[PDB]
Design a protein around this ligand. Sequence first.
Ligand code: HEM
Length: 154
Amino acid sequence: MVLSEGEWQLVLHVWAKVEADVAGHGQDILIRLFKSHPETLEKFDRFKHLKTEAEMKASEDLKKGGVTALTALGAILKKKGHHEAELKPLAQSHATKHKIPIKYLEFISEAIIHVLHSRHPGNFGADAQGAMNKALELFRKDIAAKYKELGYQG
Ligand code: HEM
């Protein structure tokens, strides 16, 4: 698929707001994912044990993982579609080392969209959400094709 430049602008305009507080957004998004889809928390051996939202809020490792995941995603979006090198190491560790199903990447995309909508209503109207959804479907479709080359799902 191909986003137009106007779509990339809408995505990079709300991402510039997320980058004012990367750790806070990282926490919100990982907690929204785990509450909504608790099976995904089993994939993180260093968190697994967390039982409540309060325990998640207070975990410095979960907050670090959020910053690590958002920073890598931010670096992919800033490429505007030219992200093949960035995607290679990321597809290899999520398919072979962590074993993350494409479905889980759909769940986090949902959690990202939920959090931006709550925190940034004025920059995340319908056209900006449509553009972010397109950018995340592009990311999921390029990662799924890599998985398939790497010997996982496809
Ligand atoms: C926007 C999507 C995602 C991005 C950009 C992302 C990025 C990363 C990055 C950069 C790391 C550190 C290096 C590495 O292992 O490759 C990481 C580790 C990890 N990711 Fe993700 N990830 C994404 C989605 C997910 C999802 C959905 C899950 C779980 C359902 C997952 C589970 C993990 C696990 C288990 C690790 C190891 C964490 C730890 O050992 O500290 N990732 N991810």
